Amino acid sequence: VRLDQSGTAVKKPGASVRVSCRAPDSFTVYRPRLSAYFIGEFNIHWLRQAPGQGLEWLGFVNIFRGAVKYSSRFQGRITITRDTSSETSYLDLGALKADDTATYYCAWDKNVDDNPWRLDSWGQGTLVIVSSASTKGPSVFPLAPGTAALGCLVKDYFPEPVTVSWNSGALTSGVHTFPAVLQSSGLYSLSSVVTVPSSSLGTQTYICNVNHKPSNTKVDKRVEPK
Amino acid sequence: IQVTQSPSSLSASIGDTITVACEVSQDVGWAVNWYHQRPGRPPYNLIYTAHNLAPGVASRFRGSRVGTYFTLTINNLLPEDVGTYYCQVFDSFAPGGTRVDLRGTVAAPSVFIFPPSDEQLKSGTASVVCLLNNFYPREAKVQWKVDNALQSGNSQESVTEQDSKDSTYSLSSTLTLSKADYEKHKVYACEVTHQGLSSPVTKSFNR
């Protein structure tokens, strides 16, 4: 089944988030005796994955009457509901912690007794970011240079993501843009590098194009040998 | 119910047969499900109830049960099989999954070191960056030294996904120092250990 989720949420610790999941045309089942489609008995599950980690189950709602089961790790700050007219489930997670930062997934369960907890379809995920930090654009520093390496250090921004291209996208061979790391400051940092012929360093211009959409920050940083 | 998977990671050549195991702390009948997650994608269901292939999953995947010991076997491994495999019992997932990548040619990293920029230094903080380029396997060790003193706790590192054409990885490590500390020392070095190196490689500069 097709599952559509709401967009990225950025929250302060202690705040609440509502993540939405819609399953268009999947809540009902044709029932010959009624000669019509009627609400089924499916489960919609909510799970999450923190950066670099495995999967964690949070809870489910049964769509027939809204019965729920929740992980005891979240009891007291989690509610899962469903709206049968819009074929949507809501995950409400309250009192948010920094370690609630994760991609949240809804997943579909046909609720067949012979196949327990089969999560047969998954949403694309919703990024939920929980931090004390405020939106901040990066500072972009050069990593200055047979083969030479050069790059850009994209430091101290919030939240994710940053994108980087080289020479407005004309330079792609040899480019590596690394995953960001979350620094102890609560701000992110990443590096992008490219390997080029050493003989080109004085003649070809190299510009890293850094884009940080959350702060409307665009930087085109010329990287010259020191 | 505790669920454990092994190995945590494995490398395989195209065409190989590989096996991932999922051990459950008590009898749960056949109620183990398997999921595959490609890099940057959502998980999807691979096998359900120990041995049933999910719709559209290739027959070279096989799930089996021996008591509390469950296996996922992948025959004729293909590049599309790269990613992480997760097993599930009811509400329990294992910690960590099993990361599968392709076995490339063993290749030592090309190493580069970058001093902090003077523009950064005006801010009171210094970042030193060490690049390990185009190496295989993914396991690598970076040790920072400052005037020959082994650094600990003040670096972070990040690794690319496996390259689609040459199966290599790259790694970037950042050493973070105060400006005051940076200017008290002369020799900044990153020492790299890797299977493709007979002895560690050190790249350095003098401030």
Residue numbers in the entry:
A (entry chain H): 2 to 35, 35A, 35B, 35C, 35D, 35E, 35F, 35G, ...
B (entry chain L): 2 to 91, 96 to 212
Q: What do the study authors state?
A:
From 831 expressed monoclonal antibodies, we identified 04_A06, a VH1-2-encoded broadly neutralizing antibody to the CD4 binding site with remarkable breadth and potency against multiclade pseudovirus panels (geometric mean half-maximal inhibitory concentration = 0.059 µg ml−1, breadth = 98.5%, 332 strains). 04_A06 contains an 11-amino-acid insertion in the framework region heavy chain 1 (FWRH1) that contacts highly conserved Env residues (>99%), providing a structural explanation for its remarkable antiviral activity. To determine whether the conformation of the extended CDRH1 of 04_A06 is preorganized for binding, we solved a 1.75-Å crystal structure of unbound 04_A06 Fab. In addition, an unliganded 04_A06 Fab structure showed that its FWRH1 insertion is preorganized for binding, despite potential flexibility arising from it extending away from the antibody combining site, suggesting no entropic penalties for reorganizing the FWRH1 insertion after Env binding. The preorganized antibody combining site of 04_A06 likely leads to a more favorable interaction with Env due to a lower entropic cost of binding.
Broadly neutralizing antibodies (bnAbs), capable of neutralizing diverse HIV-1 strains and subtypes, represent promising tools for immunotherapy and prevention. bnAbs target conserved epitopes on the HIV-1 Env trimer, including the CD4 binding site (CD4bs), glycan-dependent sites at the V3 base and V2 region, the gp120–gp41 interface, the membrane-proximal external region, the fusion peptide and the silent face. The highly conserved CD4bs is critical for virus engagement of host cells. To elucidate mechanisms of Env recognition, we determined single-particle cryo-electron microscopy (cryo-EM) structures of a BG505SOSIP.664 trimer unbound (2.9 Å) and in complex with representative Fabs from each expanded B cell clone: 04_A06 (3.8 Å), 01_D03 (3.2 Å) and 05_B08 (3.3 Å).
